[PDB]
Amino acid sequence: HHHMERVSITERPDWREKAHEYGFNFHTMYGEPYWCEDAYYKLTLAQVEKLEEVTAELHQMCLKVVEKVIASDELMTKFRIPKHTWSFVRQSWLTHQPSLYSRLDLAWDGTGEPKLLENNADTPTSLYEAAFFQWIWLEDQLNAGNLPEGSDQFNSLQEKLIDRFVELREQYGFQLLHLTCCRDTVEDRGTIQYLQDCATEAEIATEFLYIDDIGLGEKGQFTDLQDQVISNLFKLYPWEFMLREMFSTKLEDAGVRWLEPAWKSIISNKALLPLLWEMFPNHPNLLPAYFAEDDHPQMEKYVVKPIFSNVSIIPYGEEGMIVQQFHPLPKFGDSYMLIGSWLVNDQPAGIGIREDRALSRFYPHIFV
């Protein structure tokens, strides 16, 4: 029993070439899901307003977590933030460094309350499909008459991303934005090029360069492929790796503003889950979660997750682990379904639906 349905649909005949034409590599890579459109998910307006409401509040609840964590060496330690980066992460929060985006993982089928599994607040995947590709899919399958006549979609990602980039340029001085990722990863997924086009629309000058193209200047500044100073850098590379990398002590004095900013390392951290539960006990959209090392109430079945990264249900031990009450994803046919609910800064911007056979695939949605 669900209050959303998975509706089979006839695939568009030229969607693979539409992807190729837009520079979208729809294949699975580095956690990016494989696009599918032999089906779509059908929601109601009520469900979407609910998702929006919950998404905006959960985001505010996450900012409260950061505020508390940043102010106690104890919590910065329980969050495994490397001590030699504490000043870098703290100053990033105390100077109010701006955020571009986040994606909440929400378990929900329309029944009961949506539950926060995790907040992908650093390098969330499936951006292109959610913002752009599934919107073209909607426009197309409407014109082909394969969707109900009043079909809409919970998706303002592109509009909000461009408006956020205008905000960054006009009020935070982001005139030139560098964009970067690891060579031989997701540069041809389409994410970097799509965000670059959004920044360009917002009249931001952009430059792409690979992680290994970044140079270390004489006074510690980071420099691009024209040996010029990098002031603002979008990265598709997680803080969990960067804060442990060889020249991470250079971060504090590099003179670079980052998207996502360093303080997002605290939100995009599984330790978020116990802190949310302690600060907001029995919140309707939270699950019981505790640090594994702590004396905590016993749970019938739960999930163990690392504080820096494989999830399992009850081999990992206690140290560096959180536990969270098990809450099964809704099953549609042979697959479990998960909602990915996007934020642009603090503004809910819509959802993408993902499926997997195991407790891999992205499906479009509509709402009526």
Ligand X SMILES: Nc1ncnc2c1ncn2[C@@H]1O[C@H](COP(=O)(O)OP(=O)(O)O)[C@@H](O)[C@H]1O
Known binder of ligand: residue 14? Answer: no
How many residues are there in the chain?
368
Residue 12 binds what, of Ni ion, ligand X, none (CB under 5 to 8 Å, by partner type)?
Answer: none
Q: After which residues is the chain broken (C to N over 2.5 A)?
A: 309, 314, 359
Do residues 355 and 34 lie in contact, with contact meaning Cβ atoms separated by under 8 Å?
A: no
Interface with Ni ion, residue 183, by CB under 5 A: no
From candidates 20, 27, 83, 96, binder to Ni ion by CB under 5 A: 20
Stretch that binds Ni ion, among 19-27, 101-109, 189-197, 277-285 (CB under 5 A): 19-27
Say if CB 347 and CB 160 are below 8 A apart: yes
Neighbouring C-beta atoms of residue 66, cutoff 10 Å: 22
The reply, when asked if residue 158 is annotated as ligand binding, is no
Q: Which two tokens stand for residue 270?
A: 């599984």
On whether 270 is known to bind a ligand per the annotation, the reply is yes
- 311 interacts with, out of Ni ion, ligand X, none, CB within 5 to 8 A per kind: ligand X
Angle, CA of 331, 333 and 337, to the nearest 5°: 35
Instruction: Print the binding letters for residues 93-122 with ligand X: x by CB under 6 A, - otherwise.
Output: ------------x-----------xx----
- As a whole number of angstroms, the distance between CA 353 and CA 368 comes to 16
Applying CB under 6 A, does 327 fall inside the site for ligand X?
A: yes
> Please, which residue, 52 or 105, has the CB nearer to ligand X?
105
Among 151, 223, 338, 345, binds ligand X (CB under 6 A): 338
Count the residues of the shown chain that bind Ni ion, applying the rule CB under 5 A: 3
Sheet strands (E) in the chain? 5-8, 34-35, 39-43, 101-107, 115-120, 176-180, 205-208, 215-216, 222-223, 232-235, 257-259, 289-291, 302-306, 312-313, 321-325, 331-332, 335-344, 347-356, 361-363, 365-367
Which range of residues in 134-142, 162-170, 213-221, 323-331 is near ligand X by CB under 6 A? 323-331
Q: How close are the terminal C-alpha atoms of the chain, in Å?
A: 19
Is there binding between residue 357 and Ni ion (CB under 5 A)? no
Single out the residue of 177, 195, 303, 351 in contact with ligand X (rule: CB under 6 A).
303
Cβ at position 277, least distance to ligand X in Å:
12
Residues that bind ligand X (CB under 6 A): 105, 117-118, 287, 303, 305, 311, 324, 326-329, 338, 359
